[PDB]
Amino acid sequence: PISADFSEVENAPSFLSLAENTDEVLKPYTGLEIQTIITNIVGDANPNQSRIFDQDRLRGNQYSAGGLVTQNAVSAIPFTNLIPRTIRVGNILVNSANRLQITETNVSEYYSNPIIATKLSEMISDQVKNNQFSTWRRDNTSLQGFNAFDIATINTAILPNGLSLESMLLKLSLLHSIKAMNVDAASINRSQYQVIDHNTVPTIGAPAVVGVNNSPVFGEDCGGNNPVYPFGGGTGAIAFHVTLQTVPDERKSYAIFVPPAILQATSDANEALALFALSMSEWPHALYTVTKQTTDLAGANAGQQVFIPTQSTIHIGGRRVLDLIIPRREIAPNPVRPQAGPDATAGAIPLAAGQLFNMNFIGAPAFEEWPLTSYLYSWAGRFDITTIRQYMGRLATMVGVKDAYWAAHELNVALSQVAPKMTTAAGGWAAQAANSAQQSDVCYSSLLTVTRSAANFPLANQPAADMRVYDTDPATWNKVALGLATAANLVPEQSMDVPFVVGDARTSFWERLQAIPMCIAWTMYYHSRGITTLAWDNAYTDNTNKWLQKMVRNTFSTTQSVGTIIPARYGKIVCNLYKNMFHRAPAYVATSVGGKELHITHFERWLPGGTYANVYSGAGAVVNCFSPVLIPDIWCQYFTAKLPLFAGAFPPAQGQNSTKGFNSKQGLMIHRNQNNNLVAPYLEKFADNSSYFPVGQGPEINDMATWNGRLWMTTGNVQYLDYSGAAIVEAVPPAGELPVGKQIPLLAGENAPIELTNAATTCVPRYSNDGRRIFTYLTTAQSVIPVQACNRAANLARSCWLLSNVYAEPALQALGDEVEDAFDTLTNSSF
Amino acid sequence: PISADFSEVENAPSFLSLAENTDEVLKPYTGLEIQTIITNIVGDANPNQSRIFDQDRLRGNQYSAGGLVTQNAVSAIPFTNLIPRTIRVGNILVNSANRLQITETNVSEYYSNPIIATKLSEMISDQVKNNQFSTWRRDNTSLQGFNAFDIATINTAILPNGLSLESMLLKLSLLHSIKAMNVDAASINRSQYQVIDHNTVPTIGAPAVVGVNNSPVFGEDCGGNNPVYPFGGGTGAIAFHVTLQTVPDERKSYAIFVPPAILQATSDANEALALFALSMSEWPHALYTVTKQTTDLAGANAGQQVFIPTQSTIHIGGRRVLDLIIPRREIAAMCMVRPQAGPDATAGAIPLAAGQLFNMNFIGAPAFEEWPLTSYLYSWAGRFDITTIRQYMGRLATMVGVKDAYWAAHELNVALSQVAPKMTTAAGGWAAQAANSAQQSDVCYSSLLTVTRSAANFPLANQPAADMRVYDTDPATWNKVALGLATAANLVPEQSMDVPFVVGDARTSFWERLQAIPMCIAWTMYYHSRGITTLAWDNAYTDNTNKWLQKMVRNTFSTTQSVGTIIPARYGKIVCNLYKNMFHRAPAYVATSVGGKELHITHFERWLPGGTYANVYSGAGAVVNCFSPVLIPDIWCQYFTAKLPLFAGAFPPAQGQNSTKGFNSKQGLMIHRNQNNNLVAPYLEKFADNSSYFPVGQGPEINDMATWNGRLWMTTGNVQYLDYSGAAIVEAVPPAGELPVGKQIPLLAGENAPIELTNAATTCVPRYSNDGRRIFTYLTTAQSVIPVQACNRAANLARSCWLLSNVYAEPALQALGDEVEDAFDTLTNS
Amino acid sequence: SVIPVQACNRAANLARSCWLLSNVYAEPALQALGDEVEDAFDTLTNSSF
């Protein structure tokens, strides 16, 4: 919450009390909490009436330090899943001189929720089979579409993991988030076409065109019609078998049963084989683009920019050769529909390729492999989000897809909503230049720089992994999609129990708002202890200060117990800084060591390797200091139930008292080194007895003093020196300049932020790369009013927002269970 | 009921009160009692013929809006099972330039009434486990003659896969309704040969001739003299083997025992293998035709049209490999001892007509050789008389329970073989399309759901999506049932006098035509309660962004599956309750266990999602998909109904006191009145955020006050379907006040056409656009002063009506006297 | 309209101009310069009204 006076800066919760464990069961963060503040929609659903195109930013009055009120001053929503591979430089479109930002997961099978053979599986073994041991009979007890010698080779030795529908449901959770950009124009913001390319105005009118393999720079049309995989040059292979006898002799264990519940006479019914073959194989199969008509700032040069979404750059899968076994009607003996296959058509795209598809091959003979990047390229303009929604409802009737899609969905939001770093400026609204690394350099919500590609596409290098995600194995999928095994995370449901995000037009708006509390929780994690940006980068193996290696060691997921993931320590600190600070729990998955079942969130599955949230200067130079700051503060304050005390709104100037500090009555002291000219704030009592941290000590979490340090570097002329006033190794901003948010184009009657209002002031540097303590200093002449404001005998004029705090309770309808519809109050006893 | 005055409109039940669950007995609604509502009818110009050939139409007096009585005016009975493959175009027969409509079912296992092992299976259960092998090589069963070795093969099986006779007795009832056109010319309507080809009269005299593979164009001679399957390139295989130790050693698990009761059913005893090969394998085996001598409208050009029945284009089966096993005569590749296990196996009468592997060996039954299956059914294709099927069903009833299993199977061919042309937008009454057009033979179910027309050529390469879910019959449970190793709860045998009386009668095609009408009234009242305009139904899977319109199609149709069991659809129990609360008759069902709970399922609950619905064509032939789905006019909903809802009520006569009024804000409604564009709307319901766009996840409220009031303005004559603000919608609007009106058939002597909105379909008020947007019914500000005063009960309106059984022609000068007015009425029960 | 709608929802503020006066609104006097009968020459001619 933002502050009305100093008596609620002072009576704000601490960090240690707000990072404690919580035993409450909390509702999921739906993204509607930020929505019902920054838009005209407070109540309920609105089809096309609510113009979300214009409602894309934080708006409010501001109050300057000089006593003036700015009327309509805006802060951008700082997250988008769209990297502009065509940049508007000099009011005209040119190709990007920048590589594409790629991520990579760490897909591996772990001990999920345990699995058990059903009464059908004990029925096949006990009866039938066991009874063929006396009758000399080799009859067929065919289950629904498969041979008895196909079920008999699967009702066998079961792996003791249990499956997690996570990788296939992130691919479904991911192509959904791509294919939901072409829904309308007044349902997708214009700010999220302007987050990186800020010299750009997209248009109401023509919607976005979600294309595939048509990006104009650095390869990236990975076979525009001769398609390969983007990660690794190769085309894969798919084969549609009717028996396991046809799978040649080599694979036969990798063979995936397509269950007959996902293909019924309810849809196109042959697109569902492509969503199944796309969920089970590999992401990405192709490099999707989003092309939209844009215009420059005044509006002359209307062209079409090419974007590439971030979730088409996430390398997940490792299954490139699929052998799919198809249900054979009711019951038939083993044999162009040889054995009564319902279908296997190619698609809708003509696809002149290496096997030369013509326009749409209908073919399910015995072996006869196709390519897989080709077979998925043909079904790349057909995957609209309504079809994905009803496919999810057909999945939900046989397995439990409610909680696993929401965990996979905020996994998508965790590694897909990606934000440009910062720019250091004095006032408000600085950005970068065009055709430069600094405009396109970009970070996660975890304050962690996204790796861009090193060489031209399709890639042979395979960069380091970023996140540990699970996967469906084919061998357990073949028996849980067939009634032969069951678990507690796999209990089936109805299509009403599909989450609200699926098949809705408002996903590109909601998913960029779900990523803001992730960066608030990581932002408050990285700012309680200020280790700049250099003592985070080369911190994993520094032989100085064993404390710092323990910090970076524990933050990441590098431990195990039995064959399963032990989640990270200190990512539960971020999770508790999410549940306490937002009163809403993030979605976990299950992992079991043995018996004991414990929970791991995207807060606990990151991996080491990679630099952190850097800040740039006005001329593009690196200012690796402060702390890993991303989005501007007011996001890390206003949209918050309980923000810890060191991060706080400087309260408005009401009477004679505006902004004060914390003095030696709270256990603090002034540093006051060698020279008489520069003095430091009221830091801790340990600050004068250190000067360099001991090899197992770090910055003590004091929010009286971190407040009191950002209270001094808001003055506008500070230097970040030393215990003795000497320089540091770290790059310092050129003046009294702070990291400030990204500037987007304005509208009519709508202003830019004024002075340290769209800034990030909380990033107080306290721990240099060398292990020495960083002190913020002022001249003796220019520190009298800050020292007396700490002593409550003066006041400091600071700028603020003129908003008020509401923070409503959760709705739990979210446009996803509108079961009030009159035709099921009467079909209600039958459920 | 037909409204004699407006006090019978107001005193009509709501849609919610007519769609609750009911728990009564409710006998089935046979066409033997729907024939009298259309025959015993009020009229003095009615000639009252006694034969079925003339008792097809709905005849009656009509009273216009201006107060004029039309004497004998007819509404077409709009449900046939005959696609005309030879159209009367330009006064002479040309063949049709249109493809053939195909349907397809989706078979599934039953699992519901599982097999209980009898006293015999538990008897020789200890002769295998205790290894009591006091048996020999040559010992048969008791008097039926298979082998004693079938215990070590068939009694060994353990299966919980106990099935029903749902699919063999469906396709055994489809054959029945094909060869029930070959009975007499005076026992089938002439309207049935005129529903799609309206430029035609057939001729009493010679009956219709049920041929096979005789259709001239678009392929359809599916092996005209070398028969193949119509729904795939194939021919099948039959091998009549006495034992399991004689088969192709790779299909033992699919062998079908033919018990001797089937061989004792028919007097020929070899027409009953062919009725058992046709019922167990595959439908269709061939593409049946019905050729009948017809003549033109005045009688000049006598010819013979070729029809194809709708029940010979239903893909049911999924078994092409038949290996039937025949009992032995005595206790005792060896073709010298040829009755080793065989009475006989004869291939048809004379109809040989074969190609590859020529088939006219009238006797051939070796130990194991394969035949072309289609040819063996092509040869027994003039021999399946309905009296032969009648006695074949008599011995089926004596070994398994066939009473309730047939009325369910007879009711779900009427659900998908009685197929009806869509509509035509017109002003007055009686419009039709053209002579040869794709929109004339465009044709719909009783479920307001367009029949899939074949795109390829026969035999079909690409097989389309399925329409209705059915069960199957497998050999693995039939073999144990036929041998006394298995008894289920739905298989308790009965008598031959308990066979359904439809089986074997000459009046089936007239009855099935009448049983389809109260199905389409239930679906018609389902699709008209919420006005969810035909593009919203069609594009609910193509392109939808609304969470409500996708919920409406997901629920209505049987989408859900647990494991091998037809799950009944939500909101199709609403249709089933609009049949029980509305006709006071329950439709026939089967038993089905979903989660251990015993529930019943009807053909209202077995449909599958997808498909175009019943839209309307214009007079020029353009698509007019802006209404709710209509398929039959108003009078069929209103004259056949015991208790009918408010929004679909008959308009009472014109020139009377208390004639035709509406529902204003005294009943809670509100008027819209966009008078800046001279364009006002009825007293409609209150909005609550439904004004311009509906919420994402909500649709139109069930209101009968306002849907009555909206069709009260559609009948005025210049109606606009625009918007909250008055702008056009994306959907195709008719040219004027041109409501969809019924199909026109040729008239007879002393017999009139409908006059003005009397054969129309009024109830289809559009309320929900494809855009998620509300549709408003508008009149001009000048031409709506009289309907608004009718809603304010300050005026009456003048609408045309049928003068049927309580509805009297009102004089112009209402010169009323006292009350009471009971002359001979108190002398009767009043 | 985002800041007016959120000012209605009490989550923002609108900058409007005003007068810096204060409210007093005194009670009536009931002399109004029209019955100054306190004048010394009719306290003594007061019994005779």
From TrEMBL, chain C:
It comes from the Viruses. The chain holds residues 1582 to 1630 of 1685 of the full protein. It comes from Omono River virus. This is Capsid protein.
